[PDB]
């Protein structure tokens, strides 16, 4: 930890409780992954026939 460590800590924390505790109506990009993006998926192998 000689350099590049920054604001750094050691604790038992559950961050998914932390952002859902109190209330919060919009994202906060320090705790949460920034955004979704445009892509699509196949219907599955057999499933379109059944």
């Amino acid at each position: 930890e000689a350099d590049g460590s920054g604001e750094a800590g050691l604790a038992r924390v559950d961050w998914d409780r932390y952002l859902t505790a109190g209330h919060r109506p919009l994202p906060y990009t320090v705790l949460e992954t920034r955004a979704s993006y445009d892509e699509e998926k196949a219907p599955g192998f057999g499933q379109n026939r059944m």
Binding site: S5, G6, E7, A8, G9, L10, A11, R12, V13, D14, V30
Partner: peptide, 12 residues
């Protein structure tokens, strides 16, 4: 509580 003791860091 289920959570382990861990090192938490702000990364740019």
């Amino acid at each position: 509580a289920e959570a382990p003791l861990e090192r938490h860091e702000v990364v740019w």
